[PDB]
Design a binder for this molecule. Structure first.
Ligand SMILES: NC(=O)C1=CN([C@@H]2O[C@H](COP(=O)(O)OP(=O)(O)OC[C@H]3O[C@@H](n4cnc5c(N)ncnc54)[C@H](OP(=O)(O)O)[C@@H]3O)[C@@H](O)[C@H]2O)C=CC1
Ligand SMILES: NC(=O)C1=CN([C@@H]2O[C@H](COP(=O)(O)OP(=O)(O)OC[C@H]3O[C@@H](n4cnc5c(N)ncnc54)[C@H](OP(=O)(O)O)[C@@H]3O)[C@@H](O)[C@H]2O)C=CC1
Lengths: 399, 407
């Protein structure tokens, strides 16, 4: 049992992933790792009870202890309010955490040699660098229930000329929203993508729709171009790599037609959508890592890219067995452990974390998998039996 | 030559598509069809000169004559202002036309039997119903060059409680934007998708990110669900089909692992992105139709889903040969002519439009194709011997159409 000097922030979640998480912690991590966990229940009942304070606390603890492992959580809508008897529609915990921590979320597939791809052309993996700040996740939206003028107004701190924009004169009912991003957050996002692309010796592509959002998306295009020209142009030339900005509509088709082997800088929203296309295309949502790398180059939050997988939980609620892939949730733990071991200089912790990752891949390659992966092969084991095979193979590998 | 009583609005465009468009009109349409064409040059130099009035005018003309055929156009940014030396960064002509006309843009692949898919699982076609109004296309965005507060003001016209929301307090430089949609536009978009799904006898899926944009995306989900329960539940139930709302992140993955055969209602932005994933996955951006179906159920605007193909035009400008797929552009004319034929009752125009569509598919199926398609068969890196260049391919279309008209 490996002794761990510093703690790891643990963010418990919801539904099917909460079930998988409990097994990982109690049967895969804690039996072989003497680790202190700063436990934060990000389960929807606890978030409602604490009036979403538990979310902010888990993020501040992450900034403090440098490492977080997050279970998928429910982002409530009108239907969840009825289902859980909530006080209100709480903001996305992911949105709250990412806005507090900041940075770039790096997402990439967990490759298994035996799993056929839905996109055979993708011979090499692709990494998405998703901007973790602002945009839709920090937007203010409303229902306009009558006629009225929708205006935007920017009042500078320096008391210069007040700017005013008439967005829309509503003739009747509708919807409106406002959102923002900062030069400093875009800069940190840009630096992280150029640094990762150099490290991988891979070209970097950044996508926007600047032809439409000329000022909003144009700033992303401008900031990335400026930073490349000043700090990374020479390094990119030395490593025989390149940087290119493409329109999102073009980029997505370019990706699908490609053979992989590149870094893709995505805006916040595109990052979510496109990483799920990548994860599915390579094999499954259960086969993708997701790591938030903060601008300080020390703090991380590892998670799965998928959700609480509600549809599989509904079957469980009926007493029926399920076939939910836990590998991504396992990799949230291992990636959080690898980083803990890297900071502490604990070679034993890194070695265990690398070994649990390897057992996951080996188990799939040995023909033991969940329905999502069996479907890739022919068009399988239940959740608990696949997890038991992981536990068996990890104990067998520990000797 | 087929006589046509009523006119069709023709919106000319830019770069590679403008060259292709000239051949289509002069060598494929006009030699066989006596039609009045309400011409509008939406070519970037002309838009600048007329201060973008030509765009507004073309859209008003489409409302009058019920049919428009549009060539892909450049939406200018800073780099285009430098290149063309423009008066300003003019708004998207598509955004402008789409917001005046309104409706849903229906996008689907043009299927060729011998073209291998990049997504082999897609054994049946998929139609995207793209909301053509509001959102990022009617957005107001800005660069905040200094610290300051960004707030939204909603002033009700009835004189009731004026509302305020502070979006952000900028500590330094940044970006801000505001956007909207209407209940009327969402309702019309909903009705169009449900009706098309019944017509196809296909289930309908609508995607949003309502968990994040609880009010904005929530309105789409609510309006679609309201309209389904009230007007289409029985019609869907009798036709063995269903309607389902999905989160966009789940939807895109569900689509990629599907075998096709459904209608996908997309919000404005997603509609563009996902249409290009669909087009590429089925074979090419050159093999997809795009038709704007207005709320009046009479007015349409047919186009290609792709852009002006700037990269291919940059090679053309160097004097080098290009291999650009004109089929999507040909289908924009055929769909416009097909609809003109339908409204007027002109069966000979309908049959010509259908014949020219048949020629396109048969030409590719005969092994005569552009680089994009040949690359599906032989690989984009290992190719010159397996594809025809642009004009050469177009000459093959011309020859095969002549041969088809012969019999
Ligand atoms: N970072 C986070 O915490 C995220 C949370 N969410 C939340 O999750 C909830 C459910 O959202 P939903 O849209 O269903 O998204 P999910 O990603 O939870 O599930 C969507 C579908 O993807 C497949 N899938 C996802 N994960 C796995 C897995 N581990 N193994 C096998 N298959 C998987 C399943 O497909 P099939 O049904 O075909 O088997 C599943 O029904 C919502 O409340 C949402 O707010 C959503 C995204 C991210
Ligand atoms: N509705 C409209 O009018 C639209 C206009 N635009 C405008 O088009 C311009 C260029 O935009 P861009 O981002 O390059 O998008 P395009 O769709 O014009 O081109 C992107 C790439 O897709 C492939 N492609 C697209 N169409 C064809 C075709 N007909 N035949 C063969 N290959 C094709 C080519 O790939 P490869 O390079 O690999 O051969 C091409 O370089 C911009 O000015 C933009 O504003 C963009 C979208 C829509």
């Amino acid at each position: 049992r490996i002794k761990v000097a510093k703690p790891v922030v643990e963010m418990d979640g919801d539904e099917m992933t909460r079930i998988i998480w409990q097994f990982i912690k109690e049967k895969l991590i804690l039996p072989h790792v003497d680790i202190q966990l700063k436990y934060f229940d990000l389960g929807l009942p606890n978030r409602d009870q604490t009036d979403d304070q538990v979310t902010i606390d888990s993020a501040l603890a992450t900034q403090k202890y440098s490492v977080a492992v997050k279970c998928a959580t429910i982002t409530p809508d009108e239907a969840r309010v009825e289902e859980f008897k909530l006080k209100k529609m709480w903001k996305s915990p992911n949105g709250t955490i990412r806005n507090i921590l900041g940075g770039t979320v790096f997402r990439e597939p967990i490759i298994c040699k035996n799993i056929p791809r839905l996109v055979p052309g993708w011979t090499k993996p692709i990494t998405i660098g998703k901007h973790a700040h602002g945009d839709q996740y920090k937007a203010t939206d409303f229902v306009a229930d009558r006629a009225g003028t929708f205006k935007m107004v920017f009042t500078p701190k320096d008391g210069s000329g007040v700017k005013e924009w008439e967005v829309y004169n509503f003739p009747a009912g509708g919807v409106g929203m406002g959102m923002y991003n900062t030069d400093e957050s875009i800069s940190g996002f840009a630096h992280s993508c150029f640094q990762y692309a150099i490290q991988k010796k891979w070209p970097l592509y950044m996508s926007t729709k600047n032809t439409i959002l000329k000022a909003y998306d144009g700033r992303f295009k401008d900031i990335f171009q400026e930073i490349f020209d000043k700090h990374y142009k020479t390094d990119f030339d030395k490593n025989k790599i390149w940087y290119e900005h493409r329109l999102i509509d073009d980029m997505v088709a370019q990706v699908l037609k490609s053979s992989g082997g590149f870094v893709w800088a995505c805006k916040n929203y595109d990052g979510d959508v496109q990483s799920d296309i990548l994860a599915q295309g390579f094999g499954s949502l259960g086969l993708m890592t997701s790591v938030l790398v903060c601008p300080d180059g020390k703090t991380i939050e590892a998670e799965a890219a998928h959700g609480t997988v509600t549809r599989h939980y509904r079957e469980h609620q009926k007493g029926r067995p399920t076939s939910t892939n836990p590998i991504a949730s396992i990799f949230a733990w291992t990636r959080g452990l690898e980083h803990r071991g890297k900071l502490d200089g604990n070679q034993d912790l890194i070695r265990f974390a690398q070994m649990l990752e390897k057992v996951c891949v080996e188990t799939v390659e040995s023909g033991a998998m969940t329905k999502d992966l069996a479907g890739c092969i022919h068009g399988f084991l239940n959740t608990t039996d696949f997890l038991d095979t992981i536990k068996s193979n990890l104990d067998r590998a520990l000797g």
